[PDB]
């Protein structure tokens, strides 16, 4: 008996109801309130220039055709009632292949208040596009966007708005960070307009600002490269008369940089320009190759101008460490301050 | 007022026959296509395919869907596309494609008072184009996308680019990491099979590969290995440890360069341009060891001649190698 009252209410709402017409068709503009709850900010891929996000995507609008009077003010119905009524055709402009989860049932909710207001949220996983400029790799920062709007209704028919102040209409869960090598500094919420071959559409935009973490590259690339350059400058302290000893010492440090340089480029993403890591490796390769060139000069002057060969090692024991000290001073100050 | 729209749309679909095309048993129906390219990505040499995302629009007139008394262009829910006749357009060289379905199916239906229908889809497709890699990585590729009607012949349907040369937009906003889109072209023609003659629309791009990535990955490491092999011209034959260490590191790194290069391309049966450089750098390191063996072989009999060869080899090898690069780059650029 308690359910037959609500069954007659639902049957009266759908009686003569057309779900192919937006509310207020030909009369007014359908206004849709939107807000997002980011349950997790997924991994960010440099190779594909994309990121994943899992959200609770909520929408709300007014439909005069769904006004009712009964025992309850709000009807919390099954998610299959959503297909019986009209819902907005929201899509993601920069989405790539998103998922609307339906395990174990379609992850949607639909609530109708007695004044016609509808609440329609769903759980989504979106893989969006995030263009990246990797000229400052690995000290780069990015603003990954997320744009959504109507697919078929122009701004003269359907307009989107944020539920609250735009800053408070996108909330990120505290335990949602799935980022490995990035730190999510914050997000900015905005709203724009796009014009296509089929009209003007309202676009709602959110940018998530990320900064890469440099800890991994210091251990793997920067520290081994710095020690190798320091190692190759110990060759200036070996006595000049040990030609077989300095020859092996000088050559094998050049070999070590070659092995380090090649290995560091396996993880570098495929781009057409040189990053901030490439310049460091190229410069650190010049220093190691200059020590070998210096030794060839000192060896050349030995047994012909022994006095001259003694001065070069005095200069190299200071000029080489000092220039590499200046380069690190200019290199780190240039990119960290960005 | 709004209830009048429902009655109108009810009459349009009452007695409508989805099984029959517009003007069935009569003149062919004209369908105009607009493509709005959203992105291009994953131009794969291994799979010989590229991924394309676009807003694909079709535009035809159906007199069975003409309404009067409503001065509006009816934009209906996308689920009404399952009750109307739509062209059976397909992409011949498509391998794996899908219409996006978040939050709903990305599809637009829009009627007009005179019966015109606008039908748009947001399609991501993985089309196939075979690549001639005989000049890789200094090569160009022509990759297309063939649009054809499956069931209806030229006596039933007609295709044309709506707007002419402006039917495809968004090409200039694409910035590929490794390619530059030199040009795109639009072609309309008819293709004949055993079952009849069918209309075909062809959209093609010409992609030029950027050499910047391969300079840092393959060419620069190869030159450094080759240049470092000239240290053997400044070392006495006693220093076995240094000269042995050179040999192992070169082949160990050369394999790393080669294996990385090999496992990024299919197993093509010809010689690529990058192979003409690696096989050219391997000759020089092969000749540097051959020079070392010959000098040591004649060292005892004619020590003066042994030193004379080493002094010349300090100049001839850098000069010959630089001449090799000069011819190589001028030929392929």
């Amino acid at each position: 008996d308690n359910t037959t009252v609500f069954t007659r209410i639902l049957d009266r709402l759908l009686d003569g109801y057309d779900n192919r017409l937006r509310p207020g068709l030909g009369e007014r503009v359908t206004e849709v309130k939107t807000d997002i709850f980011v349950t997790s900010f997924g991994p960010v891929s440099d190779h594909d220039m994309e990121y994943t996000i899992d959200v609770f995507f909520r929408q709300s609008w007014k439909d005069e055709r769904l006004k009712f009077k009964g025992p309850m003010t709000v009807l919390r119905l099954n998610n299959l009632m959503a297909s019986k009524i009209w819902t907005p055709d929201t899509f993601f402009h920069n989405g790539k292949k998103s998922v609307a989860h339906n395990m174990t049932m379609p992850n949607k909710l639909l609530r109708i208040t007695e004044d016609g207001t509808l609440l329609y949220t769903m759980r989504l996983t979106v893989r969006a596009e995030c263009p990246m400029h990797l000229e400052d790799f690995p000290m780069d920062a990015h603003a990954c966007p997320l744009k959504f709007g109507s697919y078929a209704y122009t701004r003269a028919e359907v307009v989107y708005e944020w539920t609250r102040e735009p800053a408070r209409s996108v909330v990120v869960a505290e335990d949602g960070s799935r980022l490995n090598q990035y730190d999510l500094l914050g997000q900015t919420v905005d709203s724009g307009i796009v014009q296509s071959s089929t009209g003007e559409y309202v676009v709602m935009t959110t940018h998530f600002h990320l900064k890469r973490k440099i800890g991994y590259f210091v251990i793997q690339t920067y520290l081994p490269c710095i020690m190798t350059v320091i190692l190759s400058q110990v060759s200036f302290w070996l006595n000049r008369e040990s030609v077989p000893a300095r020859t092996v010492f000088g050559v094998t440090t050049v070999l070590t940089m070659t092995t380090l340089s090649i290995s560091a480029r396996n993880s570098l993403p495929k781009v057409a320009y040189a990053t901030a890591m490439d310049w460091f490796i190229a410069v650190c390769y010049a220093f190691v190759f200059s020590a070998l060139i210096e030794f060839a000069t000192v060896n050349y002057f030995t047994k012909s101008q022994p006095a001259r060969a003694a001065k070069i090692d005095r200069l190299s024991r200071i000029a080489f460490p000092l220039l590499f000290g200046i380069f690190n001073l200019v290199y780190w100050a240039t990119y960290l301050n960005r | 007022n709004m209830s009048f729209v429902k009655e109108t749309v009810d009459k349009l679909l009452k007695g409508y026959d989805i099984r029959l095309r517009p003007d069935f048993g009569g003149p062919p129906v004209c369908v105009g296509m607009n493509i709005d390219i959203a992105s291009i990505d994953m131009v794969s040499e291994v799979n010989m395919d590229y991924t394309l995302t676009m807003y694909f629009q079709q535009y035809w007139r159906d007199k069975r869907l003409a309404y009067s008394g409503i001065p509006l262009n009816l934009t209906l829910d996308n689920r009404v596309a399952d009750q109307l006749w739509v062209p059976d357009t397909y992409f011949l060289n498509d391998k794996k494609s899908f219409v996006h379905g978040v939050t709903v199916k990305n599809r637009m239906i829009r009627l007009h008072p005179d019966g015109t229908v606008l039908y748009g889809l947001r399609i991501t497709t993985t089309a196939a184009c075979m690549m001639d890699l005989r000049r890789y990585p200094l090569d160009e590729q022509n990759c297309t996308l063939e649009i054809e009607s499956y069931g209806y012949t030229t006596d039933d349907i007609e295709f044309y680019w709506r707007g002419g040369d402006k039917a495809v937009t968004g090409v200039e906003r694409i910035e590929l990491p490794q390619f530059s889109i030199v040009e795109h072209r639009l072609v309309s023609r008819n293709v004949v099979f055993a079952t009849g003659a069918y209309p075909r629309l062809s959209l093609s791009f010409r992609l030029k590969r950027n050499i910047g990535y391969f300079i840092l990955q393959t060419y620069m490491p190869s030159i450094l290995i080759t240049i470092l092999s000239w240290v053997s011209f400044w070392i006495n034959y006693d220093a076995s440890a240094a000269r042995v260490a050179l040999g192992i590191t070169t082949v160990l790194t050369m394999t790393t360069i080669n294996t990385h290069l090999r496992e990024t391309l299919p197993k093509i049966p010809y010689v690529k341009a990058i192979d003409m450089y690696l096989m050219g750098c391997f000759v020089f390191v092969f000749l540097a060891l051959l020079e070392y063996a010959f000098v040591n072989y004649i060292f005892f009999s004619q020590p003066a001649r042994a030193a004379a060869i080493d002094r010349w080899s300090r100049i001839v090898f850098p000069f010959t190698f630089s001449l090799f690069n000069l011819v190589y780059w001028l030929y392929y650029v």
Partner: nanobody
Amino acid sequence: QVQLQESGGGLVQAGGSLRVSCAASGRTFTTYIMAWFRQAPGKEREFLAAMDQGRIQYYGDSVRGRFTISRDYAKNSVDLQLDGLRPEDTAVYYCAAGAGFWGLRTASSYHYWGQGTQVTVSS
């Protein structure tokens, strides 16, 4: 070097079209955001409009419905269309390009800036 050279811009009489054009050189800004900023004498530098690679147009509250921004990606340029000008619009108009880090409405996110252009409205 990268240069943002801004053409157009003169004196107008209390309303009327006045198109301001910005021409970029030395770099391709297809993946960047090209915006427009205004600086009245003494007040501040104010955001006017922007457009990204996806053709999404952002407008400030004051100039919404009056100014129109377009981008010509083939020629690597951005234009601003001024309509219904007022004497309060007399200022210097700047051209900016950037990646929109920490908000595209902030002048500190645009690494490349233009020289400027003077627009005067007489009533």
